[model samples]
Target: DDACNVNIFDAIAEIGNQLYLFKDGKYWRFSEGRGSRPQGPFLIADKWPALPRKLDSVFEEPLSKKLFFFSGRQVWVYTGASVLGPRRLDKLGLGADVAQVTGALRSGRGKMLLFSGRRLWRFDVKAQMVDPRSASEVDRMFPGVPLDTHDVFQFREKAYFCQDRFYWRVSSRSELNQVDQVGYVTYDILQCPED
Candidate 1:
């Protein structure tokens, strides 16, 4: 199971300063963003009893700051257990077709984003129906990011893209242009003191 060494993350999101990481049916919650000791490998339903297991992606709407959890073709909006939605992605006009969402994050220019395979969509949650014009190939927009970026989010106004065992961050300065080993961040995120 490679339990000693953590690898890929199924989903990640920040909820009210708490950073959560998901893999399989379990998750770990860190105290707060930027820094905090990670806690738990708890059952996903233990926290959100209504949501299903094995998350694909998760993000918080910047304007409303509401949490949205995605898996397969379904999305659920949650604000600490008061849940809404089990909505299909297509109904939201994402036009994802059969490709499930692999990433979701904030975007200043496009408003918001959802990534599926090698493509990415600019979505406007306030309006519900995201248009085709808003969708673009990840290769076209995120030049250096991986095509399989499975987890994404914004923190401190900067966007991050993650795939497999590495991650990338984007901003005007391009601080994270170079790929970073996932362990570099997860080490502190997990607070692994070592064996």
Candidate 2:
């Protein structure tokens, strides 16, 4: 077994230019493009007081500058400093166990794309609602990105995808360029140093 007990469990989110990696109720911050190890392993409770531990997914709404954390049944929003809600997923027209959010990304057009297993939902920041469409229908939106994406984030005016240890950059609607070998690095920067 490992000493630090790092377990991603699909909990990763990008806010601004920083990547938040959560595992085992703790979180680490990774700066984009820095190519260094992550900082801290702080308790989720300590950092975001109202947020819950062991979140299923986390993502930031670029347009609103708000953060969202999703558990199986509840969805929480963090407004920079303070936090809000344990809102029911049903409010978004999703069944209780249907959408177990796994990955998230903000599109170039300022929309939020949330992925849950093979399904994806589009969130409108202004309306505070999710589009009732499946991932397959929105395939044209992400271009070369597959519905099975592991994680996604925006950096330097472009979107990047992490799938099965392969790192790809979305250059155009129909093109995906492999940028580099991926493993330790989080959100395109900040390594996860090993002992």
Give the number of the best model, judged by TM-score: 1
Per-candidate alpha-carbon RMSD to the true structure:
3.5, 4.1
lDDT tens readout by residue for model 1, 22-135 = 888788776744544577778887778877777888887777877888888898888766898898888778775735777776655437777887888778767856787776
Instruction: Give each model a TM-score.
Output: 0.82, 0.72
**Backbone clash pairs in model 1 (N, Cα, C under 3 Å; residues 3+ apart or in different chains), count:** 0
Off by over 4 Å in 2: 1-9, 32-36, 95-97, 134-150, 155-170, 174-188, 192-195
Q: Give lDDT for model 1.
A: 0.71
Residue 34, candidate 2: Cα error in Å is 6.2
Best by lDDT: 1
lDDT of 2 by residue, 43-80 (tens): 88877877766677777777677788888778888887
What local lDDT score does residue 84 receive in model 1, on the 0 to 100 scale?
87
| lDDT of candidate 2 at residue 185, scale 0 to 100 | 37
